[PDB]
Design a binder for this molecule. Structure first.
Ligand SMILES: [Zn+2]
Lengths: 45, 315, 52
């Protein structure tokens, strides 16, 4: 569920509370919580 | 006697000399122990005690007089100034015998403290014992001959106070090197504020040599998340990073197919997790392929119960 | 840094006095001087002991 995305290598993934901060394939420790697919509603004004 | 030989010690009484009565220091052999005290001196002949149990009922034991004294523990007395002397050397009897073939393992201070229990000080006080020959033995001509006589005097003074009696073995010691990731973590910890802070005095060197041994066993043990990934992260163990896995993999597999029951020896239960993940991965590799045999390890420690012991020791 | 906006000089509303200005609401609705602000909160786990 909780998805994660790599720095610039565009690796998409998901860490759990069992592993350190490390992009699984690129070996990049600057990872980013992948955005929520959930819709956000706006007022357009 | 220790708690691992309590029933044993009562057993030889029962078998060799039934006429000798015996009473262990437990619920059987706060008033109940006092009715136990009733006729434990006239009717009771020999009293048994675990060397943790004296300070459970010492209120009514150290008071009355005693005869012959036996202590089957020569490594839980060691040097003076401990709870040992507090509950032991206050006994009232010349007869004092210790049953242990390894009394001297750390220093002659342990020798003096062990001689104190048997004899009232045929040598002298602790300051006297030290100032006599402590430094000369350590430093040592200018030392040898005078030291030789000062030591043979001690040998003749204590020799009639402790008896002394004594396949093949191969001792191969392998000198492996620190790996590059190991050398990096070694230099990083080597040049840090905490080491100097320990040296100056606010902390103890015991916590700085435990962490530099923590890195020699393998790199992945100096991590702050040790418990959080010990048994739930199958990358915590790894291999070839410790500088000793290769001389472990090769050396253990040279006996795995050779069928040689071998002993793997550690000191920490934390490194057991790493060597256990490693051997489970070895098991997985062997089971996936063929013409092999399961590694079949087991781990024993203080975490387990006193009941298990012999069972695994037997299996 | 800034925008080129339309200003006229007069005393029409009486609210323009004393360092106050009167604004066109249409420009604001269209987004004149609308902007984006960003605030970064930094957080971290800490070591009370070595394993704590
Ligand atoms: Zn990556």
């Amino acid at each position: 569920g909780v998805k994660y995305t790599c720095g610039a290598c565009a690796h998409n993934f998901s860490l759990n509370k069992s592993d350190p901060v490390r992009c699984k394939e690129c070996g990049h420790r600057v990872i980013y919580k992948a955005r929520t697919k959930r819709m956000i509603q706006f007022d357009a004004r | 006697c220790p708690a691992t030989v309590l029933r044993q010690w009562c057993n030889e009484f029962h078998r060799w000399w039934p006429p000798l009565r015996v009473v262990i220091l437990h619920a059987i052999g706060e008033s109940r122990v006092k009715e136990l005290i009733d006729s434990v001196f006239t009717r009771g002949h020999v009293i048994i005690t675990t060397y943790v149990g004296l300070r459970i009922y010492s209120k009514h034991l150290l008071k009355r007089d005693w005869g012959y004294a036996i202590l089957d523990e020569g490594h839980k007395i060691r040097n003076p100034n401990s709870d040992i002397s507090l509950t032991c050397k206050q006994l009232r009897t010349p007869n004092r015998v210790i049953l242990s073939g390894t009394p001297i393992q750390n220093n002659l201070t342990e020798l003096w403290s062990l001689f104190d229990f048997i004899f009232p000080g045929r040598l002298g006080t602790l300051p006297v014992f030290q100032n006599q020959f402590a430094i000369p033995i350590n430093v040592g001509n200018l030392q040898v001959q005078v030291g030789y006589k000062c030591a043979v005097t001690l040998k003749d003074l204590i020799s009639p106070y402790l008896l002394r009696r004594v396949p093949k073995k191969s001792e191969m010691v392998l000198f492996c090197k620190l790996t590059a990731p190991q050398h990096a973590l070694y230099e990083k910890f080597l040049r840090s504020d905490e080491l100097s802070r320990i040296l100056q005095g606010k902390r103890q060197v015991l916590y700085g040599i435990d962490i530099l041994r923590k890195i020699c066993n393998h790199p992945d043990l100096v991590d702050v998340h040790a418990k959080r990934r010990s048994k739930k992260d199958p990358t915590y163990g790894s291999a070839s990073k410790s500088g000793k896995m290769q001389v472990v993999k090769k050396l253990l597999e040279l006996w795995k197919s050779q069928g040689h029951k071998t002993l793997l020896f550690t000191q920490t239960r934390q490194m057991l997790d790493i060597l256990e993940s490693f051997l489970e991965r070895l098991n997985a590799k062997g089971a996936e392929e063929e013409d092999f045999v399961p590694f079949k390890f087991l781990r024993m420690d203080g975490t387990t119960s006193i009941g298990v012991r012999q069972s695994l020791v037997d299996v | 840094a800034g925008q080129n906006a339309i200003v006229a000089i007069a005393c029409y509303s009486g609210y323009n006095q004393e360092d106050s200005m009167i604004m066109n609401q249409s420009s604001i609705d269209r987004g004149l001087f609308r902007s984006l602000f960003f605030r970064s909160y930094m957080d971290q786990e800490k070591r009370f002991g070595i394993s704590i």
